[PDB]
Amino acid sequence: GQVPIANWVSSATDWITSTFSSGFDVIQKSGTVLMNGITGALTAVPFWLMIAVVTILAILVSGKKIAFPLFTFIGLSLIANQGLWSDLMSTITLVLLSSLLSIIIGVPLGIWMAKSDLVAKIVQPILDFMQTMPGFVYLIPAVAFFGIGVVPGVFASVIFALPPTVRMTNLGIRQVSTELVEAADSFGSTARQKLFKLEFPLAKGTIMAGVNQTIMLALSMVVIASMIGAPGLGRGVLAAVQSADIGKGFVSGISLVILAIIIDRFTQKLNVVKKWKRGIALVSLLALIIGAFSDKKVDLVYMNWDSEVASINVLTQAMKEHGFDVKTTALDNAVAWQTVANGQADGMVSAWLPNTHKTQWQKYGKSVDLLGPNLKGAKVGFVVPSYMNVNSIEDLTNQANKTITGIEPGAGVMAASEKTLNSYDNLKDWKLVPSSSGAMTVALGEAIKQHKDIVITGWSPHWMFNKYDLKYLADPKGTMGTSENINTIVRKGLKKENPEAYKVLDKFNWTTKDMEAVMLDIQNGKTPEEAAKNWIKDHQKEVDKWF
Amino acid sequence: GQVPIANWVSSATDWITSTFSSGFDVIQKSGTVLMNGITGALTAVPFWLMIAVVTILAILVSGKKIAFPLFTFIGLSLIANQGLWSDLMSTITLVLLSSLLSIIIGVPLGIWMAKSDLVAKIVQPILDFMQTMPGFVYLIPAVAFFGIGVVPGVFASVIFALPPTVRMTNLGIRQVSTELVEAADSFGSTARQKLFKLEFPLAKGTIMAGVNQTIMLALSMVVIASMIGAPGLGRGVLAAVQSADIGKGFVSGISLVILAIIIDRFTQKLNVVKKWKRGIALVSLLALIIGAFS
Amino acid sequence: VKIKIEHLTKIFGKRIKTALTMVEKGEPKNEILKKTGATVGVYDTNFEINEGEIFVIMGLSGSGKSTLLRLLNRLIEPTSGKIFIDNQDVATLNKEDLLQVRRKTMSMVFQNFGLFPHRTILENTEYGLEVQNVPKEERRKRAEKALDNANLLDFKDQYPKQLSGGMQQRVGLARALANDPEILLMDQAFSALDPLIRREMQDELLELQAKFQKTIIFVSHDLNEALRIGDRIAIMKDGKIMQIGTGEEILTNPANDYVK
Amino acid sequence: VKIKIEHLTKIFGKRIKTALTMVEKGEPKNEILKKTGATVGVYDTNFEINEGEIFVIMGLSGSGKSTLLRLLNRLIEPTSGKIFIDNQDVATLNKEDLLQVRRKTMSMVFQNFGLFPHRTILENTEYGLEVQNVPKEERRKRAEKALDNANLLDFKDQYPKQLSGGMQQRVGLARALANDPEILLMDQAFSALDPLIRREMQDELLELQAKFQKTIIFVSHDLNEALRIGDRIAIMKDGKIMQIGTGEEILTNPANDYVK
Ligand SMILES: Nc1ncnc2c1ncn2[C@@H]1O[C@H](COP(=O)(O)OP(=O)(O)OP(=O)(O)O)[C@@H](O)[C@H]1O
Ligand SMILES: Nc1ncnc2c1ncn2[C@@H]1O[C@H](COP(=O)(O)OP(=O)(O)OP(=O)(O)O)[C@@H](O)[C@H]1O
C-alpha cells in the first residue's frame, strides 16, 4: 500500500463524523420515533384482522381469480402461526420506507438521466458504486451518523435498491418511439404533459420491472439492516445462521419471500362493481385504523450469539424486577463497539478480551471504559470432535486434509491461529481458510454426521460443546489463547449521567457454568426470558448482590 | 411454531446431503481445481501486462474517447499498488463464472418464459424466492452440500443474479412490436430465426440492462461468498469490518466498484479498421498466452 | 384454380356468438358493435381465385380487406370458414408444410410496411431469402436487382428511419418480389407512390404475370390502377362482397357510387 | 401573406459541407449520396404562402415534402435558411411563444398517423385540446363532432390496434382539425382513403377554408384532388421546387410528365 488511501479515508471519516453530528442526531431521533410509531401502530392491529383485510384487498384487485388471495391468506396465517408477526410488521415498516424513498428519488432521477445525455454518464458510475460497493464498509460511518435503529437500514436499502428503478426508468423514457414524441411536440405539449401523457404510460413496463427489482433488493437488504439494530426477520436469519439451523433461517426467508410476492402483486396490479369494490376497500382500511386505535433506564448492545443472549437477558430481567426500563439491541460486533464508543449506547457486556476482540479494544479503548471481567472461565483455541484420537496440537499430522477451519478474517482467533501455524512445526504446512462462523458450524455439523475429521478455531462458552461432543487441543506454547475473560464495557460518561446502572454493570458478574445451564435450558426450547426468570429464581442472592 | 416447517427442512437437507454426497463432492473438487487453475493462469500473467492489455482493449472498443480506458488504467494501477492483485484475480474468476452461468440459465429461461404464459406464472414466484431469500440462508445449505471453498459462492451468486436477466429477457421479447412478428411469420421464419434475427436484436436494450443488473448483483454477492470461504476482496472487507478500519474496507470496495465499472462498460460496448482492431486484440491474447507460459 | 374461400368469417372482440347471430339475421356492423363491441371484420366471404390472375380487392376503409389477406396467409385464424390453397386447407397444415407454403407459395406486403429498423434495405429485402437458406451471393444480387427495379439501389446501405414512406413501401414490395413466390398478397403497396413510380410498379407486376403466370391479390383504393391491371375485381362493404366482376361493374352495379 | 420561406435548406447525414458545396454546383442527389452518404432532403426552397389558401405540395417519393412540413413546424432545424410565420422567424422563438404557435397557429398530420396506442380515439382526438387546458366537456364534444364528420363516432371507445389504416388516418386528421388552428399541415392524409370518404374530407376542407379563411398545406400524390381543391400547387423533384402554379402547370411545364 504505497498510496495511503486507507489513512486518508479514516481521517476524513473521523473529521466528518466529528463535525456533522448535531443535525444528524436530531434527524435520527425524529426518524426513529416516526418508524417506531408506525411499527407500533401496525403491531397493535390484530393479525387476524390484517390478514382478512389483505386477502380482501387481494380479491378486489385480482377480480375473479383466487390464486393471489389464497396465497396471501395461507402465507400470512402461516407466519402468524410461526410467531413472526411483529418482526413482519417491522420489516414492512422499513421495506416500505426504503421502497418509497427509492422510487421517489429514482423515477425523477431516471427521467433527468433520460432528458440529459450528460447526467446519464454523471450518474451511471454513481449507481454502479451504490449497487456494487459492499454495504459493510459504509455501515460503520452510517452508524456513526444515523446511529442504531431503522434509519440506517432504510438508508442502506435505499442506496442499494434505487439503481434498478433509475436505470430501467431511463431506458423506458429513452426506448419510446420518437415519432410519437414529434407528434406530441407538434401539439404544444410541455415536457411535463408529454411526460405524464405519453412517456410514463408507455414506459410503465420497464419502470415497473425496475420497481419490482427495487423491492426485491430492499427485501434482500434486511439482514444488512438487521445487524445494526433494525428489528424484523433479519434478526431471525442472523440467529439461525449463528445456530446453523436452516429451519429457522428458511422460515424467516420464506416469510420475506411471501411479503415480497404480496407487495409485487399489489404493485404490478397498478400497471393497467367498481364503486362497490372501492368502497369496500376504504371500509377495510377504516376498520384497520379502528382496530389499531384499540424512571431509570439503560440501552445495551449485544451480539446474536447464545452466550451474550443469555447474559443480556439475565441482566435485563435483574434490572426490570429491580426498577428499570431497559432497551437491549442485537447488533454486530464492530457496530456494537462503535455505538458504545460514540456514547449512543450505555454499554455492553460482551468484550471477550484480550485475545478475541483485541483489534476492537485497540482501535477503541480511548473512547470507552473497561469495567473489568464479568465472567471468567472462557477459553479460545483449536477444537476437534471428541471422537478423534488426537488430543494435543503437537500430534496433528494429516487430519482435516491438512486444512484448518476459520471463523472470520481479522478476528483475534484467526490472528492467533496464524501465529500458531508459524510457532509450531508439525502443522507448518497446514492451512487456514477464513470463513464465517455459520459456515464453520455447518461444516462441523456435517462432519459429525459423516464422522469425518475436522479442526476448527473455536471458543467456549458456545453451543457447539452442548449440541455436539468436542474437545479442545493442548497449546503448550500458549500462542493461541490463555483462558480469556468476558469483560463489561460502557460509554465514556456513564458515571456522571446514569450511575444507578454503572453500579450494576461494574458489579455485574456470574459464572460460565450458569451460562451453559441457561443455554441448555434455551436449546431444549424455552425462551431466553423464561430461562432468565428460572436462573434468577435459583440464584437470587447473587442478583441482589449485583445491586 | 405449531407447524414444524423447521424440522421438515432440517430432515430434507439431511436426507439430500446424505444421498447426493457423491455428486456434491465431485462437483466441489472439479470446480475448485478448475477455478483455482483459472486464477493461477490470471495471476501468473504479470499485473503490468494485464493492465496494459485491458487498457488497449478499452482503447480499441472506445475509438477515440479516453476517459474509460484512462479510468481503467488508473483503477487497475491503484489496485495493483495496494496489493489487491491476487484478490482481484480471485474475484474476477468468481464474478465471471457467476455472471456467465446466470446469463446462460436466464436468457434461455427468459426466452422460453416469453413464449409461454404458463411458464411466466410458474417462474415469477421462483425468481421472487431466489432474489428475496437472504444470502445468509444460502450459506447453510451450500456449505452443507458442497463445503467451504469457491463453488458455494458461485451457487449463491447465480441464485441471486439470475432474476434480473430472466425478467429483462422476458420483457424485451414480450415488447417487440407485433407488426414485425407478423411480418417475420408471414415469410416463414421459425422461432429460431425469428429469435436470432428479430426479437433479440431489438430487445438487446432491456436484455443488456438485465445483464448489467446481474453483474452488479453478483459483485454485491461477494462478501457473502467470502463469508463461506470464497477468496478475494470480500475477505478484505470482512477483515476491515472486524478490525473496524474503514480505510481497508473502502479500498476493497473501490476495487470491487472499479471491476464492476470495467465489466459493465465492456458489456455495454456489445449492445451496439475493425479488422485491424481484431488483429491487435488477437496479438494481445497471444501475448497473454505467452505470459501464462512465461 | 388456385385458391378457394368458403363461408370465410372472422369476427374480432368478444361476445362473438351474439354478433354472429346478428349478422345471420343481417343487421349492420355499427349496431352490432354498439351492442357487443365485436367488430365484424368479414362475413361469409366465398369465392375463388385462379392462377395467373390479378384479383384486385377494393372497398371502403373499414370493410375487411387486410383481414382477408391475413386470413389467407393464416396470420390470424377465422371463427368459421375454410381457406383452400392448392386443395389444402391451410388450417389443417402442420408447421413444416405451412412454412414451405409461406416461403414459396405466398408472400405478403403490408400497409405499415412491416420493416425491421435494425436492418438495412438490403437486409430487409433479402429476409425472405435468408430464411430459405439461400446463399449470401444469389440473395444479395436478387435483392439488389429488385431494388434497382424499385429505384432504391443507392439506398441499399441505409436504414428505414433514413427513408420516407414511399421508399419503405417499395422496400416491402421488393422484399415480397425478391422471394419470387407463386402468390403475391399486397395490401395497398401503391398508396404512397407518385404516379410515375406507381406506373413503373404496375408494369413490373404485369410483366411478372405475363412471363411467370403468377397469382396476385392487390388491395387498392385507386380505381385507375385496378382497371389497368385487375383481370378481376372484388368490391367489399361492411365486411361482405358485393360484386366480383372484372369490367362489367361500371355497367351494372347495385348502388355502387363507389365508381361514380 | 402568412408564411415566407427563404433559402430554406436541410441536409441529413454528415459531411454536410461537401454535400452543400456539391449542390451549390448543381450535382444530383444520388451522386452526392454515393460520395458522402448525405441525402439532400431539400435545397434552396424559397416561396410564400398566403392566408386562406390550400397550398398543395406534390412530387416524387424522395423529393423532400414531409421534411418541409416538419421544418415549418420546426420539429427539425434546417442547416441554412429562414422560415417566417406571421413575420416571425420560428428559429428565433422562445419556448413559450413556440408553444403558443404550435398550439394555435399550426397543427400537423403525419404519414404514419402519429397515434398513441394507450389512448382511445376520443383521447388522441382531443390531445391537442388537453394540452391547451380546455375543459373536459367542450373538448370531448369537439372531438366527437370531428369523429362524426370523419365517420368514426362508433369507434370512439376503441384503440388504434383495433383499427385499420384509413380509420387511423382519419383519427390523425380529426385530431388536427379539432384543435381548429390557423394553419393545417397535412402529409398525405388521404393516401389510405376510399374515393367517397376522400371526397367527404375534401369537402370538409373546402368548407373550413370558405368559412374560416384558413391556411392549409396539403401534400398529395393524387392529381384529381390537388386540382379539385388546390388553389395553388408546388411540384418538387430531388429536393427542389420546379413550379408553384395553380392550374397553368397542365399547359406549360418543363418536362413534367408527372401530370397527364
Ligand atoms: N387487432 C384487431 N382487433 C380488433 N379488431 C380489429 C383488429 N384489426 C383489425 N380489426 C377490425 O378489422 C376491421 C377491418 O380491418 P381492415 O384492416 O380490413 O380495414 P381496411 O379495410 O384494411 O381499411 P383500409 O382498407 O383503409 O386499410 C376494422 O373494422 C377493425 O375494427
Ligand atoms: N431521419 C432521417 N435521417 C436521414 N435522412 C432522412 C431522415 N428522414 C428523412 N430523410 C431523407 O429525407 C428525404 C425526403 O424525406 P421525405 O420524407 O421528404 O420523402 P417523401 O418526399 O416524404 O416521400 P413520400 O412523399 O412518398 O413520403 C429522403 O430522401 C430521406 O432520405
PDB file of C-alpha atoms and ligand atoms in Angstrom, chain C residues 155 158 161-167 192, chain D residues 12-13 29 39 41 60-67 70 111 187-188 221, ligand 2:
ATOM      1  CA  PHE C 155     -30.143   3.496 -50.567  1.00  0.00           C
ATOM      2  CA  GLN C 158     -29.380   2.987 -45.403  1.00  0.00           C
ATOM      3  CA  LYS C 161     -35.560   5.684 -40.365  1.00  0.00           C
ATOM      4  CA  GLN C 162     -33.348   7.303 -43.018  1.00  0.00           C
ATOM      5  CA  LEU C 163     -36.162   6.767 -45.537  1.00  0.00           C
ATOM      6  CA  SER C 164     -39.621   8.085 -46.334  1.00  0.00           C
ATOM      7  CA  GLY C 165     -42.984   6.363 -46.704  1.00  0.00           C
ATOM      8  CA  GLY C 166     -42.738   5.676 -50.415  1.00  0.00           C
ATOM      9  CA  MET C 167     -39.254   4.191 -50.273  1.00  0.00           C
ATOM     10  CA  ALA C 192     -47.698   6.316 -51.007  1.00  0.00           C
TER      11      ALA C 192
ATOM     12  CA  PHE D  12     -29.227  14.943 -43.447  1.00  0.00           C
ATOM     13  CA  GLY D  13     -26.396  12.647 -42.540  1.00  0.00           C
ATOM     14  CA  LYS D  29     -28.827  13.858 -55.207  1.00  0.00           C
ATOM     15  CA  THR D  39     -29.100  12.780 -48.619  1.00  0.00           C
ATOM     16  CA  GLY D  41     -33.690  16.476 -48.156  1.00  0.00           C
ATOM     17  CA  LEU D  60     -41.862  12.078 -56.311  1.00  0.00           C
ATOM     18  CA  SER D  61     -41.450   9.931 -53.219  1.00  0.00           C
ATOM     19  CA  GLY D  62     -37.988  11.015 -52.137  1.00  0.00           C
ATOM     20  CA  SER D  63     -38.265  14.685 -53.057  1.00  0.00           C
ATOM     21  CA  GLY D  64     -38.456  16.429 -49.682  1.00  0.00           C
ATOM     22  CA  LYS D  65     -42.103  17.065 -48.815  1.00  0.00           C
ATOM     23  CA  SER D  66     -42.501  15.729 -45.277  1.00  0.00           C
ATOM     24  CA  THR D  67     -39.193  17.396 -44.426  1.00  0.00           C
ATOM     25  CA  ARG D  70     -41.570  19.309 -40.383  1.00  0.00           C
ATOM     26  CA  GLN D 111     -47.914   9.967 -42.904  1.00  0.00           C
ATOM     27  CA  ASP D 187     -48.754  14.963 -45.098  1.00  0.00           C
ATOM     28  CA  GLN D 188     -50.774  12.522 -47.213  1.00  0.00           C
ATOM     29  CA  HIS D 221     -49.766  12.263 -54.858  1.00  0.00           C
TER      30      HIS D 221
HETATM   31  N1  LIG E   2     -34.317  10.673 -40.116  1.00  0.00           N
HETATM   32  C1  LIG E   2     -33.700  10.841 -41.328  1.00  0.00           C
HETATM   33  N2  LIG E   2     -32.341  10.699 -41.406  1.00  0.00           N
HETATM   34  C2  LIG E   2     -31.804  10.883 -42.653  1.00  0.00           C
HETATM   35  N3  LIG E   2     -32.384  11.184 -43.834  1.00  0.00           N
HETATM   36  C3  LIG E   2     -33.741  11.313 -43.693  1.00  0.00           C
HETATM   37  C4  LIG E   2     -34.449  11.154 -42.472  1.00  0.00           C
HETATM   38  N4  LIG E   2     -35.823  11.347 -42.649  1.00  0.00           N
HETATM   39  C5  LIG E   2     -35.955  11.623 -43.962  1.00  0.00           C
HETATM   40  N5  LIG E   2     -34.709  11.605 -44.633  1.00  0.00           N
HETATM   41  C6  LIG E   2     -34.460  11.865 -46.036  1.00  0.00           C
HETATM   42  O1  LIG E   2     -35.410  12.804 -46.410  1.00  0.00           O
HETATM   43  C7  LIG E   2     -35.627  12.668 -47.797  1.00  0.00           C
HETATM   44  C8  LIG E   2     -37.052  13.074 -48.056  1.00  0.00           C
HETATM   45  O2  LIG E   2     -37.738  12.757 -46.944  1.00  0.00           O
HETATM   46  P1  LIG E   2     -39.486  12.875 -47.433  1.00  0.00           P
HETATM   47  O3  LIG E   2     -39.953  12.281 -46.134  1.00  0.00           O
HETATM   48  O4  LIG E   2     -39.493  14.341 -47.705  1.00  0.00           O
HETATM   49  O5  LIG E   2     -39.598  11.845 -48.575  1.00  0.00           O
HETATM   50  P2  LIG E   2     -41.279  11.965 -49.160  1.00  0.00           P
HETATM   51  O6  LIG E   2     -40.887  13.018 -50.161  1.00  0.00           O
HETATM   52  O7  LIG E   2     -41.841  12.402 -47.840  1.00  0.00           O
HETATM   53  O8  LIG E   2     -41.602  10.580 -49.754  1.00  0.00           O
HETATM   54  P3  LIG E   2     -43.371  10.462 -49.757  1.00  0.00           P
HETATM   55  O9  LIG E   2     -43.583  11.860 -50.282  1.00  0.00           O
HETATM   56  O10 LIG E   2     -43.707   9.256 -50.590  1.00  0.00           O
HETATM   57  O11 LIG E   2     -43.474  10.399 -48.248  1.00  0.00           O
HETATM   58  C9  LIG E   2     -35.467  11.166 -48.114  1.00  0.00           C
HETATM   59  O12 LIG E   2     -34.675  11.054 -49.240  1.00  0.00           O
HETATM   60  C10 LIG E   2     -34.750  10.602 -46.879  1.00  0.00           C
HETATM   61  O13 LIG E   2     -33.537  10.040 -47.216  1.00  0.00           O
END
